[PDB]
Amino acid sequence: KHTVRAAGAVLWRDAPATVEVAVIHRPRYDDWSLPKGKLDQGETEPVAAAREIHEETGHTAVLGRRLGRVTYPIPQGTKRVWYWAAKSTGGDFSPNDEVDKLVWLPVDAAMDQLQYPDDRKVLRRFVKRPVDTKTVLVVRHGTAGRRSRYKGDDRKRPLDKRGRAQAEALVAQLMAFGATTLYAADRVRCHQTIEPLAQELDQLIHNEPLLTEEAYAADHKAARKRLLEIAGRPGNPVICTQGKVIPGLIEWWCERAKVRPETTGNRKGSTWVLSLSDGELVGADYLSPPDEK
Numbered sequence: 001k002h003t004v005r006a007a008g009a010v011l012w013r014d015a016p017a018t019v020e021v022a023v024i025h026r027p028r029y030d031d032w033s034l035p036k037g038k039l040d041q042g043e044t045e046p047v048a049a050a051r052e053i054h055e056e057t058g059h060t061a062v063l064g065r066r067l068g069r070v071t072y073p074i075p076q077g078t079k080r081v082w083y084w085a086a087k088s089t090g091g092d093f094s095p096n097d098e099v100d101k102l103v104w105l106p107v108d109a110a111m112d113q114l115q116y117p118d119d120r121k122v123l124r125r126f127v128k129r130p131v132d133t134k135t136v137l138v139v140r141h142g143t144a145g146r147r148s149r150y151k152g153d154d155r156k157r158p159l160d161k162r163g164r165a166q167a168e169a170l171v172a173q174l175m176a177f178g179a180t181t182l183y184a185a186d187r188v189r190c191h192q193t194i195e196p197l198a199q200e201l202d203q204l205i206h207n208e209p210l211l212t213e214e215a216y217a218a219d220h221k222a223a224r225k226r227l228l229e230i231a232g233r234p235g236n237p238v239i240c241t242q243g244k245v246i247p248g249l250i251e252w253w254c255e256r257a258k259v260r261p262e263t264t265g266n267r268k269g270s271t272w273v274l275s276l277s278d279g280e281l282v283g284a285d286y287l288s289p290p291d292e293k
């Protein structure tokens with residue numbers, strides 16, 4: 001009942017029935033499996049997936065759609081693994097004592113190579129939908145204290161200490177999915193959330209008056225329109241906004257596209273990873289704040 005948290009991936013490259021996937025061998029278990037490992041202190045599942053892919057296969061990669069969760073018993077209690085689709089961005093495997101072989105296989109043959117039922121289940125998920133996706137990241141701003149007694153939402157109220165720390169932690173989280181462009185509702189706490197990422201990308205953050213809670217409540221259709229407008233642009237946008245805005249936009253998009261989120265929440269510092277194939281939503285993955293389970 002203690003949970004050892006881990007992440008990994010179906011790492012792929014071009015040759016759905018075209019694509020090749022990576023399967024690894026480990027001497028210590030003499031198993032064939034998917035690359036993965038334990039979260040380090042301070043790490044989120046996406047950040048650990050990318051790191052473990054790199055350490056185990058030599059490859060950098062961009063994460064896309066989440067492919068569900070697997071659990072199994074270990075002496076410390078229960079092993080929990082979240083898996084992502086990850087597109088290789090290059091690298092070269094070198095055999096070692098931890099992982100001594102890596103084979104790239106079409107899905108077909110990878111299904112037969114993978115010895116664990118739960119890995120085959122993940123690979124079944126992977127082929128269920130397109131994997132060459134682009135990504136919209138919708139982020140609820142970090143912790144910023146408590147609303148004041150006044151009407152409206154306190155335009156200038158800043159992130160608190162914990163929130164500033166969530167902002168910093170979100171850089172590696174959002175980079176894992178290849179974020180390229182930045183957008184924030186017209187509130188200071190929304191900008192401050194994505195400022196560390198802005199510095200890292202050396203990028204400017206677009207301001208979004210249409211996506212504040214006041215504007216969403218006065219004209220929800222214009223917010224929706226704007227979201228699609230941004231999603232349509234080239235690149236992988238981060239859009240940081242507020243708690244009364246996100247659930248409505250995410251539900252609206254999921255319903256119209258018949259996409260079922262596997263997890264749901266709306267915490268401050270959380271991220272929805274919205275995977276698109278040819279402008280259609282194919283996944284909506286809720287990621288917890290970086291400082292929460």
Ligand SMILES: Nc1nc2c([nH]c(=O)n2[C@H]2C[C@H](O)[C@@H](COP(=O)(O)OP(=O)(O)OP(=O)(O)O)O2)c(=O)[nH]1
Pocket residue numbers: 006029031033034036037038070072074079116118119
């Ligand atoms: N990779 C993998 N191993 C599994 C699965 N199911 C399962 O019982 N095992 C076994 C193989 C080992 O006997 C035992 C521990 O393996 P592990 O891969 O979870 O643990 P680890 O700490 O050595 O490796 P890691 O999590 O750091 O990558 O669990 C599975 O779905 N995937």
Ligand SMILES: Nc1nc2c([nH]c(=O)n2[C@H]2C[C@H](O)[C@@H](COP(=O)(O)O)O2)c(=O)[nH]1
Pocket residue numbers: 029030031032112113114115
């Ligand atoms: N190497 C190895 N393969 C296994 C085990 N259990 C299991 O079903 N397999 C499957 C995966 C592959 O389809 C096949 C590979 O065998 P070799 O690695 O010995 O060639 O056997 C095991 O403990 N070790």
Ligand SMILES: [Mg+2]
Pocket residue numbers: 035036037038052056
């Ligand atoms: Mg491992």
